[PDB]
Design a protein around this ligand. Structure first.
Ligand SMILES: [Mg+2]
Ligand SMILES: [Mg+2]
Ligand SMILES: [Mg+2]
Ligand SMILES: [Mg+2]
Ligand SMILES: [Mg+2]
Lengths: 137, 350, 49, 48, 161, 182, 40, 58, 183, 133
RNA sequence: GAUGGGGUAGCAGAACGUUGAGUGAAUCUUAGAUUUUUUUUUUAUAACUAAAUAUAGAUGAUAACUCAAGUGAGAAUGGU
């Protein structure tokens, strides 16, 4: 008699079969008054129009935010957000920061420990002392 | 206020509508991003993708909602996942075949697929919300999608008096996943197990609708590719869905049915007997062939665990990792079809 | 005190305490919801300006 | 064109229209501080 | 150690000797049977359909049995008429004609006696209480070890143990 | 759902190192148990802790409405023959709660207050040192037995959720190498 | 604290304590702790 | 295979797949010149309410 | 990471090994010819092989922090092999911090009070890492003077034949020939 | 091109017929033992790649199954297998501060390091049929 | 497919921060300015995101650039 368990679901592997860009939305906030927003205003007029055209899968919302530094807040599919203050950064420095949010994921920063990350079992099962030629002390 | 003009121009009689108008979808940056995030074909306009986000809980109209789009899509997902599992694991018991279906095209996985697409829900449905938001009402579970399953005459006595329900009857009466059929407003409250299920159901109908939309617009082949890329691309260990009762009897009944020699448990290896954590490697042999192997701490458990592994190997037999499905023939000019292995059925034991 | 009493009624609900039946606040010597003769009669000598 | 406030976000999500009815029923002020005066206890005592 | 790089060199384990014999003059395929437990997906040839062409001699060929643990025997010593006697005695006095008494007299397994007949309800409830009165004499340390034994068995059949 | 009273005593003429031992004695006990230990204590401050603990209980009953179900609770024990609840505190003491409304000392700590006075200690060689006369306060958090029953049910549930002990555990290998060692 | 003369406020809380414990009056939540508009 | 990119100095490079080999870089002052789908394109796509997939393919 | 995904139960299980201090060891002996001169493993050379098992350093999943060691049942410790005059000229020392309380004893005198099992424990003990796992690993060394011990049923087996028995090898190769009859 | 060995032409069908397969790809010489579906996190920012780019890995040191193992002398022939990855994005670590200091010297020089890492996803690992070759 | 990379005494260059002032009769703030905290992100002696608590319309705060210093403390048996 075999009884089915009803508490196990399938897991998704982004990239296998279909790929989905993690950055769902990017929020650009500028000040018409703050001096630190001089470079942001230049990025919204020259580099954002073409950058937003190359990433049709990202939602861009350009809204002002006076009395505040300029920030680039990116919302990701995992629910988290990453805000980068770009005060006193030239336009080309904003584009390098905006591409950082695009290529990035919501995951929190972690130290490099292991290159490979796998969820499938070993092709050659884990070692066992009872499945070999035996060891004689 | 004059100091805070409205960000989005909308008529005065907007919030009174169940959902935003169709033309509203043509000025929303969330849909344009959602359309490009899934690489949908340009044949699917934004007015159609906006209709896949309006659940029947928000718009009772047969149109403007997700009722019909999700119905056509559910049949495509359920069909492609069914044929693919019978061709890959043609010996799976019926019980495990229902859980595997519910593990791929069920409300739980589809909910994760909807959240993998960056689809954020709306608090309360209305004509003012962004068309790119999933609209539904978790407080009204009245709406129920139409399914091919029929209601059982003894359903009342089934839930109350614990009457027996067989597996062979679920393929006709029960739904596609083996479950039975038919099993002003104050928002000052908290979440409920009813809303959690109503919200999870709303996400599943959206994913299914996207397949129905791709079908009506792009065609059958495009819909199959979308299902094969987002749903079938997921990982599931079907070996973990097995729960055995008296596996030693089921194995004896299997060898008896297949004429194999009666199974005999032999002790391949052992160590630490008369200790706190011994190890007994018991292998069940049918004559001189090794059917299965199990290593446990108790002599009895090692024999039971070996019988399960011998039974899983029988049911989990796979002709190939990527076998051909019967739907591949109807595409066009395909290679001649080769008959697929059809098992007789799972073993019924004492 | 009113900032903390408004938070308990919002939280405790049916267990809101009967503050009117409590002891006085020795920090002032006043009862619940009662002013002081100096603060109720405004007998405080104010500057000329 | 203007700064997005917490009110605008609720309007997009649809929850604003539900906040107006509740606050109105309870008589609390919808957008504003209502017709309530400022703290005067210290002022009446000659507070600088 | 001081850095992670040094810690990695001290905790190193070399690869299996089969991989160390890297080939020369070209590519080759070597037979490398690992010393591990095979998965339930390596279906034995005995469980492969007669149509499956993948059936083939051992890949090793392309380049007494162990001790018995459980070999039961089935016996049928009860006739169709004796089954009627088992149902009469069990209902006449379920205390004297217990399953162990009938199992001995009729030379059958104790389970088989239970299959033909069951004791009257009030007698079954008496059995469940006897085991319930002994479960209350268990302290917090024994009653917890018994619940684990009942959960490890459930976990074993769920593929967890 | 659970009543609670945070009562801060008055300024007692004692130190923290002296009164702390009196607060750790009544910790976890019932108001009645604590009062009996203060009546028969040899410490001078036990007389002030007994008066301050009777005031706290008066406030817990009038303002918070605690310990006002003894008559009703007693009816369910004997009249209906209901067996009381058996729990075990975090420290491990087993209790039999016949009245879920009984008040007890959930938490208790001591805080130091202002300085009573200053006495000069005149030593030899014409040296003088100041001696600070301390004053301390005590804070007791009175709760009902409904809290100890709930907290107990959470611990036993947390223990049954950690799974049983398995003989051969699947311990992980915490090191990745780009090759097979077996 | 044991030598402080009991004031009129402490002589009233002792009379209520004997009334709630006796069963004459039934305890009820406070209604004048704060004048909120929600009234919940 | 390279997804669409924006070269800060040249312009928007359309998607190119070297498996079938075309890196075309379009630069301009209007959304149409860039070679992407504009709001106007989405409006004409939504007005073609008559196009329908072939029944044989459906 | 896939290499470590699976059932690590049997990799961490304790295996009960066995070795006799009198059986010649062609590997752990300094004499290799003639075969009739092959001696057993000397005291220190046997202790170096045992310390490797107690640490689990013979396993491909070894980790110094994890106690992945095994048991080693040593028999015939009375005929423990030693070279030269170690048996009568080697000395073991002891001091309890009290000046004048220096305790000395030779190997032959220590083998009379606590048998050869204590001489093998001090050797293995000094070859183990000086940490908090030294007492657990050493406790898994079962040393006995003769052929009898309470672990004759714990010794690892392969088809009923204890490792080191006459026909244990052919019993292992016979079980692996059947494991190849599968995909 | 150099013809494949006759011994590899007869056992490769048996290698691809088994359930699972693994490979040891070599990116810039460094090996990575991966399986179809794994996620490789390279310790460097691959220049000139955006999330969604598909890469074809052509340097494999070992491509083996449970029992069989294919080994090339420098590497395996590309015509035997086909491995592809997809660029998933770039990740960064937390800032680490290193304090370079000497005894009896107040100056503490700080070194701030925050590296980026390219993340891949092995979406294809299949062995080809070389019956014709 | 540029070259270079430890450092005391010591020399040199480039910056941040603190306090006050100018632009400033400027800019922003119950659609939450400010909140000694917590949290998030960014090559970061710094700012930023968000949360929690309290409630200000200026004797409030403030970008940018510049000006002037009672301008940066684990070390003086230092002082309070
Ligand atoms: Mg004097
Ligand atoms: Mg150097
Ligand atoms: Mg230098
Ligand atoms: Mg704050
Ligand atoms: Mg100092």
């Amino acid at each position: 008699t075999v009884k089915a368990l009803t508490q196990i679901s399938s897991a998704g592997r982004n990239g296998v079969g279909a790929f989905v860009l993690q950055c769902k939305k990017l929020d650009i906030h500028y000040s018409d008054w703050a001096g630190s927003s001089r470079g942001m205003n230049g990025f919204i007029k020259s580099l954002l129009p073409k950058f937003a055209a190359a990433n049709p899968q990202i939602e861009f919302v350009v809204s002002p935010r006076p009395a505040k530094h300029p920030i680039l807040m990116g919302h990701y599919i995992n629910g988290r957000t990453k805000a980068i203050c770009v005060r006193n950064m030239e336009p080309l420095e904003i584009l390098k920061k905006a591409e950082l949010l695009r290529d990035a994921s919501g995951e929190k920063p972690q130290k490099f420990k292991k290159p490979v990350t796998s969820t499938n079992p070993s092709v050659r099962g884990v070692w066992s002392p009872y499945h070999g030629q035996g060891m004689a002390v | 206020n004059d100091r805070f003009p409205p960000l989005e121009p909308l008529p005065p009689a907007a919030e009174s509508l169940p959902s935003p108008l169709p033309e509203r979808a043509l000025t929303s940056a969330k849909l344009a991003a959602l359309h490009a995030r899934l690489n949908l074909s340009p044949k699917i306009p934004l007015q159609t993708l906006a209709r896949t986000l309006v659940d029947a809980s928000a718009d009772e109209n047969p149109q403007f909602n997700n009722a019909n789009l999700a119905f056509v899509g559910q049949t495509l997902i359920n069909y492609h996942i069914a044929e693919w599992l019978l061709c890959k694991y043609p010996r799976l018991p019926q019980g495990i075949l229902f859980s595997a279906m519910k593990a791929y095209a069920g409300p739980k996985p589809l909910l994760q697929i909807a959240r993998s697409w960056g689809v954020d829900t709306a608090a309360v449905p209305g004509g003012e919300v962004d068309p790119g938001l999933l609209q539904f009402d978790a407080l009204k579970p009245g709406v129920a999608i139409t399914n091919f399953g029929y209601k059982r005459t003894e359903l009342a006595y089934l839930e109350k008096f614990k009457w027996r329900r067989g597996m062979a009857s679920r393929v006709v009466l029960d739904d596609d996943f083996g479950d039975v059929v038919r099993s002003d407003v104050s928002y000052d409250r908290y979440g409920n197990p009813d809303t959690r299920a109503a919200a999870e159901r709303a996400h599943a109908y959206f994913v299914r609708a996207v397949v129905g939309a791709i079908y009506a617009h792009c065609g059958r082949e495009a819909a199959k590719a979308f299902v094969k890329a987002h749903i079938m691309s997921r990982t599931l260990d079907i070996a973990k869905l097995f729960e055995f009762k008296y596996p030693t009897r089921e194995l004896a009944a299997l060898c008896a049915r297949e004429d194999f020699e009666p199974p005999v448990a032999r002790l391949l290896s052992e160590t630490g007997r008369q200790s706190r954590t011994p190890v007994f490697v018991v292998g069940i042999y049918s004559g001189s062939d090794k059917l299965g192997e199990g290593a446990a701490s108790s002599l009895d458990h090692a024999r039971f665990k070996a019988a399960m592994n011998a039974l899983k190997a029988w049911y989990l037999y796979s002709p190939g990792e990527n076998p051909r499905v019967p739907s591949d023939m109807l595409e066009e000019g395909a290679k001649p079809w080769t008959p697929a292995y059809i098992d007789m059925g799972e073993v019924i034991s004492r | 005190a009113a900032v903390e009493a408004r938070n308990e009624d919002w939280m405790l609900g049916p267990l809101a305490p009967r503050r009117e039946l409590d002891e006085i606040t020795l920090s002032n010597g006043n009862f619940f919801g009662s002013l002081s003769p100096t603060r109720a009669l405004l007998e405080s000598e104010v500057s000329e300006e | 064109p203007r700064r997005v406030t917490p009110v605008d976000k609720e309007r997009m999500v649809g929850r604003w229209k539900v906040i107006q009815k509740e606050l109105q029923k309870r008589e609390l002020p919808v957008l504003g501080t209502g017709n309530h005066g400022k703290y005067v206890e210290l002022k009446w005592l000659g507070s600088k | 150690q001081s850095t992670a790089n040094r810690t990695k060199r001290m905790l190193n384990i070399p690869p299996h000797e089969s991989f160390l014999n890297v080939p020369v003059e070209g590519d080759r395929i070597i037979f490398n049977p690992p010393s591990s437990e095979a998965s339930v997906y390596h279906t034995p040839f005995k469980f492969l359909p007669r149509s499956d062409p993948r059936r083939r001699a051992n890949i090793y060929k392309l380049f007494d049995l162990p001790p018995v643990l459980y070999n039961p025997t089935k016996s049928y010593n009860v006739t169709p008429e004796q089954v009627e006697e088992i149902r009469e005695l069990r209902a006449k006095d379920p205390k004297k004609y217990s399953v162990t008494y009938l199992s001995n007299k009729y030379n059958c397994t104790k389970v088989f006696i239970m299959m033909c007949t069951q004791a009257p309800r009030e007698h079954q409830e008496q059995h469940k209480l006897a085991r319930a009165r002994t479960a209350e004499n268990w302290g917090p340390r024994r009653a917890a070890a018994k619940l684990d034994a009942r959960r490890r068995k459930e976990m074993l059949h769920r593929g967890e143990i | 759902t659970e009543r609670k009273l945070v009562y801060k005593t008055g300024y007692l003429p004692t130190s923290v190192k002296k009164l702390v031992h009196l607060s750790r004695q009544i910790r976890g006990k019932t108001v009645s148990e604590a009062l009996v230990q203060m009546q028969f204590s040899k410490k001078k401050m036990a007389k002030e802790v007994k008066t301050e603990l009777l005031r706290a209980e008066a406030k817990a009953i009038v303002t918070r409405g605690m310990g006002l179900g003894k008559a009703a609770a007693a009816a369910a024990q004997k009249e209906t023959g209901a067996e009381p609840v058996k729990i075990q505190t975090k420290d491990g003491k087993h209790l039999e709660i016949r009245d879920p409304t009984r008040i007890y000392v959930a938490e208790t700590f001591v805080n130091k207050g202002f300085t009573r006075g200053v006495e000069l200690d005149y030593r030899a060689r014409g040296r003088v040192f100041k001696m600070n006369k301390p004053t301390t306060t005590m804070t007791v958090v009175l709760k009902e037995e409904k809290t100890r029953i709930r907290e107990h049910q959470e611990r036993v549930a947390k223990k049954l959720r950690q799974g049983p002990w398995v003989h051969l555990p699947d311990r992980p290998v915490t090191s990745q190498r780009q090759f097979y060692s077996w | 604290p044991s030598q402080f003369e009991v004031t009129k406020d402490r002589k009233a809380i002792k009379a209520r304590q004997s009334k709630f414990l006796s069963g004459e009056e039934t305890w009820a939540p406070g209604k004048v702790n704060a004048f909120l508009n929600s009234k919940i | 295979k390279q997804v669409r990119r924006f070269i800060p100095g040249v312009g928007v490079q359309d998607e190119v797949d070297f498996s079938k080999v075309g890196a075309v870089v379009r630069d301009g002052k209007r959304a149409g010149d860039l070679g992407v789908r504009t709001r106007s394109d989405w409006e004409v796509i939504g007005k073609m309410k008559s196009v329908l997939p072939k029944v044989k393919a459906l | 990471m896939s290499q470590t995904v699976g059932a690590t139960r049997l990799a961490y299980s304790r295996v009960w090994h066995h070795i006799s201090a009198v059986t010649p060891h062609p590997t752990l002996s300094t004499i290799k010819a003639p075969s009739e001169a092959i001696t057993p493993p000397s005291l220190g050379r046997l202790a170096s092989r045992i310390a490797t098992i107690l640490m689990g350093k013979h396993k491909p999943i070894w980790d110094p922090s994890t106690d992945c060691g095994d048991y080693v049942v040593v028999t015939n410790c009375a005929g423990l092999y030693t070279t030269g005059h170690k048996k009568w000229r080697k000395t073991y020392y002891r001091h309890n911090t009290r000046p004048g309380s220096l305790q000395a004893i030779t190997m032959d005198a220590l083998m009379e009070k606590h048998g050869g099992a204590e001489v093998l424990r001090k050797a293995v003990s000094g070859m183990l890492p000086k940490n908090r796992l030294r007492d657990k690993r050493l406790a898994r060394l079962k040393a006995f003077e003769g052929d009898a011990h309470p672990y004759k049923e714990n010794l690892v087996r392969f088809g009923g034949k204890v490792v080191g028995a006459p026909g244990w090898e052919e019993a292992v190769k016979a079980i692996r020939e059947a494991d190849m009859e599968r995909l | 091109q150099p013809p494949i060995s006759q011994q590899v032409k007869e056992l490769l069908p048996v290698l691809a017929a088994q359930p699972g397969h693994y490979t040891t790809i070599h990116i810039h010489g460094k090996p990575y033992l991966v399986t179809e579906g794994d996620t490789v996190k390279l310790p460097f920012k691959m220049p000139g790649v955006a999330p969604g780019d598909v890469l074809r890995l052509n340097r494999a040191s070992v491509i083996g199954s449970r029992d069989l193992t294919l080994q090339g002398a420098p590497y395996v022939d590309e015509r035997l297998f086909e491995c592809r990855a997809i660029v998933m994005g770039t990740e960064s670590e937390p800032m680490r501060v290193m304090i370079k200091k000497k005894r009896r010297c107040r100056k503490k020089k700080h070194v701030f390091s925050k590296h980026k890492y390219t993340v891949l996803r092995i979406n294809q690992l299949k062995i080809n049929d070389v019956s014709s070759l």
